[PDB]
């Protein structure tokens, strides 16, 4: 009932009582542990009781439990969602819920930031264009000239499920992939069939390495637009080492702004299908990621011979040694343009701290191990000495079906 | 029920039947995942069954299910168990039963190597010096100057838990550790506590950065009894670097010949509480954790220093280059001086191989991701982006609590 986890470089042991409110399910089993598992409309009845659950934590919060206001906002709701089968939150619960369905990420290694989200709520958009116009706003806040500012543009919630707001692309900005005769890929292999999509849809692709993918909006259920992102609010950072004057030739650059796209967020049973939210890059996502998965744009090889280091034997450790000069890299070409981004080290002893302070004020933190220790140098973090449950509380982020595999024009 | 885990590298999808023969818990729930925690005398009643299973694994195994030698065993096992209240092994299910706790360890990644364990027969063993005999002869065979054999040594399982045959190390070879005075520590410090409990014991310390520990040896339930390796057993290697001349200055070395010595091996519902094993190292173990960790020799800073690195700054990864060479370093030490030795990509490989093959022969293999993944350069190693399931078939390795915690002395 009340869990404890130690962290073993340490020895300090937090009890977890926090956990005892989660209310989904984990994939796992008493039998069987699917902790490695990438991915392990509502009615009436099912409504009330996540609105009640979700009030009641918000009138909790504002230390207003079983006040007049808590009965009677509980009774207002009741009533709407009897009769609309649905209801609606107001701003202060909208922004509460968001701030929290980022608190409750267990994936989020970044979460010591959750309560300082900007919430954009987008609730009144009703066409493409208008979903077009709040995410550039949403791009160009968050962008900040480089001083990134993490924020969430929300727009409207599910109704009957043939009226769903979509942002087709899985991340606000992302570079395009194409299958070349060659058979090998030009661009990010990761968006090749988006890519296509886009193509399929009217997009003019400039088949480039690096080229920033058109949005692809859906709004009110109806058939997605493209867009393309003002190139003037898409800050980008030539990537460049700090001793490897060569480096620069491999001609390589990444976005400045990481925004997650293809999401829902859950708050009080309600469901946000658009909810398009960004923060700030920690180094290893680009470097190790992005760079040298062998599925992404796997970069090891070329940078090792650049670099003169023995291939011929993998106990040579050449991958290892190169890359690390790569991530070492792109947070030098990050700091020096001056956008924000964060190296593994700093985020991971950062979200200890988070972890203390959660466990203290509010008696736990669900937090995925798997997804928290950063790809490279593992136990060289705090992260990853330190014991994790992992459990789903809601407000949430979830995944869900890609669109293309759902809508019927 | 069918479960499936994808290879998101690859795309290679598995199925998983095994999982079904699963009994033992793993200690999450429906709402709980402790898939990251360290450490989440059996009755006649509860023998039985447990004996039966692994029969009927181990003459299944052997094609003869339903067989007249399969069902005589059952009729003798079970009589000397309501007999008894326990019952012997014969050796050919104890070699099988060995064999199968190594390949149904979850956290292991060198298990493509698990049919070929040397199971040494310690059960005619009666004193602690006939345990370090046995030990003795177990370290020699398996280091085989430098050509590491991966071996076991089981001595008599237990019987009423007052008569329990332990091995007081955690490792038959590892460094002393010295709390000092000032706070600091000298030599390892994950073995200070056990240091202190050969010295009160009677082991007089060189007190270096590493002295090879001495066995701390339990017969029978008996108090445990010193005894020193003879050192021209104990193969060590110096380490040094390929390129930095000044790496071998540092003073650092290790033993070649990783051996686990406190663990308990579970077969048939028999527990054998002393049962050490070995096979060789991976590089990591050694580079990262044991020279790295911050609670071990942490070294990180004198080698940054020593390459001149910009320590200034975290986001400089002076702690991720020095640690890459430091691994270097191991591998290649290990290799100039031929004793077995394993890099991390290699090894990765190689447990992929043969985490298909078990799924494609055996219906699955039980895997435990976080400690499957090396400790550096995670996602550049194919086990990163493989999903895997972890689940407890027996026999099995177990943990079990340390015996200075829970021996009865005698005097
Ligand atoms: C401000 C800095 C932030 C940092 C440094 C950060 C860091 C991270 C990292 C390293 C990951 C793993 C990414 C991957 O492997 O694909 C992650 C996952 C995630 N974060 Fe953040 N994050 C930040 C902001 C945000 C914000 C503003 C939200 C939500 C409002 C959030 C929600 C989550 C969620 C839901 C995931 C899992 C996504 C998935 O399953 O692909 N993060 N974050
Ligand atoms: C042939 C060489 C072998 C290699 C390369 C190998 C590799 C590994 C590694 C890297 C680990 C994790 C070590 C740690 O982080 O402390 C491990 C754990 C494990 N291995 Fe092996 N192994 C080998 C042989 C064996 C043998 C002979 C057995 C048993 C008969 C075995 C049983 C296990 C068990 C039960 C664990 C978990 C130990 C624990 O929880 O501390 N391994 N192995
Ligand atoms: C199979 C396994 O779940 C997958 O390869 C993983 N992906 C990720 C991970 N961790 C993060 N942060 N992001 C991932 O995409 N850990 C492992
Ligand atoms: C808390 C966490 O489970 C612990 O720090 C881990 N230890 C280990 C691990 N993996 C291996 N191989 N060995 C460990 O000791 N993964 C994580
Ligand atoms: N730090 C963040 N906000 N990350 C969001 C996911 C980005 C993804 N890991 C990438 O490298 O593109
Ligand atoms: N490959 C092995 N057999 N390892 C056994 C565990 C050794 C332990 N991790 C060490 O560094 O000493
Ligand atoms: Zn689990």
Known sequence: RFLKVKNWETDVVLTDTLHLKSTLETGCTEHICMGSIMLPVRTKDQLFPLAKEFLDQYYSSIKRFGSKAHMDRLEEVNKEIESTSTYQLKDTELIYGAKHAWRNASRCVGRIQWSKLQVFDARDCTTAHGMFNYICNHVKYATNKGNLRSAITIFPQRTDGKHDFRVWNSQLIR?????????????????????????????????????????????????????????????????????????????????????????????????????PFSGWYMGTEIGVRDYCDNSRYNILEEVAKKMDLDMRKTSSLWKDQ???????????????????????????????????????????????????????SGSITPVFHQEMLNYRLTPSFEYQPDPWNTHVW
Request: charged fraction near 20%.
């Open 322 to 376: 190169a890359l690390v000069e790569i991530n070492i890299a792109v947070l030098y070409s990050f700091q020096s343009d001056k956008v924000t981004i964060v190296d593994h080290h700093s985020a991971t002893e950062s979200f200890i701290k988070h972890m203390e302070n959660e466990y203290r004020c509010r008696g736990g933190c669900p937090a995925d191990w798997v997804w928290i220790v950063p790809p490279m």
């Open 175 to 275: 570079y395009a992939g194409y299958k070349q005769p060659d058979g090998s890929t030009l661009g990010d292999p990761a968006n090749v069939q988006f890519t296509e999509i886009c193509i399929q849809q009217g997009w003019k692709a400039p088949r480039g390495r690096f080229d920033v993918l058109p949005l692809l909006l859906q709004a009110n259920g109806n058939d997605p637009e493209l867009f393309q992102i003002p190139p003037e609010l898409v800050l980008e950072v030539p990537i460049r080492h700090p001793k490897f004057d060569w480096f620069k030739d491999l001609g390589l650059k990444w976005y400045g702004l990481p925004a997650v796209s293809n999401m829902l967020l859950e708050i009080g049973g309600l469901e946000f299908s658009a909810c």
